[PDB]
């Protein structure tokens, strides 16, 4: 009479409990939401693709996208029902999704070799991968006669209070979530179903504040946490940060990028970097936080003019992926970032978006707490930060293919 946290293989009890839940939750949807759902079932693939990619445009392009009304209303439908205890869910991924850019086995082979398994473990095991968008999940491990489109099965623990919409699609019970978080894969085991080998990955949610296009909500949080930060500095620190902010950034960052501190030491500058840095530890980032930086090519050893930078050609994505996926880039300069994901005039044309996950307690500040600052909803991160590039995604902005880099700050 209570559902377990994990229906495991018990398909019959899964359906039975979920059909009941579907009839209950369905009662609580308003008109907008039922409509959104009826819309989703007829167009799930296009609607999900939009929910992955929507924040990356200019606000005015967001506000007027015809797909946007359906996104907001489907979003609201999912979050009407919030689980009272954790539930495990099951779904197939393509291995591309975790930057394993090669088949695990073919669609015809039944065994997954000792090598591939092991290679797969090195690729996916030690990272937080960002998930985003509407996803269909199942409440039981599939068995005989359920679709099994990949060698990769995800077994994910959704925490208490995760939004989950169970619903009848004519004959079946289906389960809809909006992924709004990151995943860690704690283990991978092999498993057999209907004669073939599969990989089951045990995954858990790591949560992060991500305001995406909601720059206002993002600002509230920034000012709520950072408007007393200015008063926490020493006289010296205040002045050296005011200097950075008001225009000193180009000389400090230029000095760092050539590794002046070692190659040609400048003691005024060094002291300035020392103070800014110390200042960035006065209010450590109080919560796990996703930030967005739109990047120049120079940041990835490239120029506006490099033919490797035309991402309209798969080769170049594939080559950028080789160079960077799985790698870690170090930033010698102070890195300025925004809690907003939107496109902005100052960088309209930039083609690489570094989407960064900042662990709670990392050095950083919401510089934009200080009025008049030209940076937009800006968080500044410390010089010498390293970023693990777990995954490279791509999207169309007009005719221009740009890149999203799932990254993690590792100190």
């Amino acid at each position: 009479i209570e559902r377990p946290e994990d229906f495991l293989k018990d398909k019959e009890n899964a359906i039975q409990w979920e059909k009941k839940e579907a009839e209950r939750v369905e009662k609580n949807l308003d008109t907008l939401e039922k409509e959104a759902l009826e819309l989703y079932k007829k167009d799930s693939e296009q609607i999900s693709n939009y929910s992955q990619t929507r924040q990356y445009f200019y606000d005015y392009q967001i506000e007027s996208n015809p797909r946007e009304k359906e996104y907001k209303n489907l979003r609201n439908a999912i979050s009407k029902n919030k689980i009272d205890k954790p539930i495990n869910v099951y779904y197939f991924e393509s291995p591309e999704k975790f930057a394993f850019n090669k088949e695990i086995r073919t669609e015809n082979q039944n065994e997954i070799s000792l090598e591939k398994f092991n290679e797969l473990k090195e690729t996916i095991q030690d990272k937080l991968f960002k998930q985003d968008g509407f996803k269909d999940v199942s409440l039981y491990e599939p068995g005989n006669g359920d679709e099994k489109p990949t060698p990769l099965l995800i077994h994910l623990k959704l925490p208490k209070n995760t939004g989950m919409l169970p619903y009848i699609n004519s004959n079946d019970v289906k389960t809809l979530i909006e992924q709004d978080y990151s995943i860690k894969i704690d283990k991978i085991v092999r498993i057999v179903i209907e004669g073939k080998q599969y990989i089951k990955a045990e995954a858990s949610i790591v949560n992060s504040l991500d305001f995406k296009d909601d720059v206002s909500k993002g600002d509230l949080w920034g000012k709520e946490n950072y408007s007393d930060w200015s008063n926490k500095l020493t006289p010296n620190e205040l002045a050296d940060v005011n200097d950075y902010m008001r225009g000193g950034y180009t000389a400090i960052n230029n000095y760092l990028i050539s590794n002046g501190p070692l190659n040609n030491p400048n003691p005024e500058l060094d002291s300035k970097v020392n103070n800014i840095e110390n200042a960035l530890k006065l209010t450590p980032i109080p919560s796990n936080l996703i930030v967005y930086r739109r990047s120049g090519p120079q940041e990835f050893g490239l120029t506006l003019t490099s033919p490797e930078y035309d991402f309209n050609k798969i080769e170049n994505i594939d080559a950028f992926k080789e160079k960077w996926e799985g790698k870690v880039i170090t930033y010698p300069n102070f890195i300025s970032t925004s809690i907003g994901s939107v496109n902005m005039s100052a960088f309209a044309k930039r083609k690489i978006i570094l989407r960064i996950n900042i662990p709670k307690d990392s050095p950083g500040a919401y510089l934009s707490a200080i009025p008049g600052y030209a940076g937009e909803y800006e968080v500044l991160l410390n010089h010498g930060s390293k970023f693990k590039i777990n995954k490279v995604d791509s999207y169309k902005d007009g005719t221009v293919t740009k890149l999203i880099l799932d990254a993690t700050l590792i100190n």
């Binding site: 200019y58 008001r246 960088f347 009025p371 600052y373």
Partner: protein, 360 residues
Amino acid sequence: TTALVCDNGSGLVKAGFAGDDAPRAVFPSIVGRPRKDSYVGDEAQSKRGILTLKYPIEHGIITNWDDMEKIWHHTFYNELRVAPEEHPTLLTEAPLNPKANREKMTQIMFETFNVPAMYVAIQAVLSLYASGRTTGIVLDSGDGVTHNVPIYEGYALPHAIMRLDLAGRDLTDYLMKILTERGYSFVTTAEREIVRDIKEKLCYVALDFENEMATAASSSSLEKSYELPDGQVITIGNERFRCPETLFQPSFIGMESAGIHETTYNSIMKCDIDIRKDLYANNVMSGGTTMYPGIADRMQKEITALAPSTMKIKIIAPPERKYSVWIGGSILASLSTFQQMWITKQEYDEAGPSIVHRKC
């Protein structure tokens, strides 16, 4: 009884008397980085080193307060030959100038220069005002920064202001680079001044860039020639429109921001839909860098291409465009209904630097 108007630009100071049609002094907004001690403005067109050229305003914002004081000092004593104590003073500021910053200005004006009264106006609002307007969108493009500033009923809409750190100074550097690419060598700071002149003298904005490239390649019709101080005369070809093409394609210069047509559009689009028609009809250009022949026509074409096809689009490029900020200040400082707007020594003594926010 006669107000001073002083327009503080990234590269040029425009200064003079309210009620006049043109400023009386315009001079370089530079001082000195020493080894008698430091020469200020057009006088540092002398020892520019090893007592070297420093710029106290960068990208429209004051950042070196000490050299700023010296600029102001020079303005009053060396240039305008007046006593600051004797004249209410209107100063201009960049769009989105921080409060902190507006207050430092006030404090210094009152305490260091002992002005009887003062006011700070937004530079773009005054340009609009110079051409009889109170609603409109201004492209202000100077030496160190360019802005798109939508304004409704005398109010700038700070959330829709676009800022590009791309302007005349970068355009001269780029003319230097490309002229060097042709086999000349323009690299020193002295040479930087000659290319400024070449830029102001011979550059223009092609109505159709790719077409102008084709004309220049296949015939000779577009070449002009120029005499250097040493009497050498050089030829200049497609550099003539390539240079200010950077304003539309910042990528010419490695920059990845939107161009001035796109920031214009963006700016308009961040404004609420009932006022947009008003903005499209009332696109005002101002600043030395909007002086290129062809630019108004080119802007007309680009904005037409982005806007809905039922939109009335008017570009206003006054011939006085390069002093229109100053002029707007002259008109304001004489406007009679403007006189209650001044901040007196008395009100400053009472309310402090903060009074400078009145609501206009």
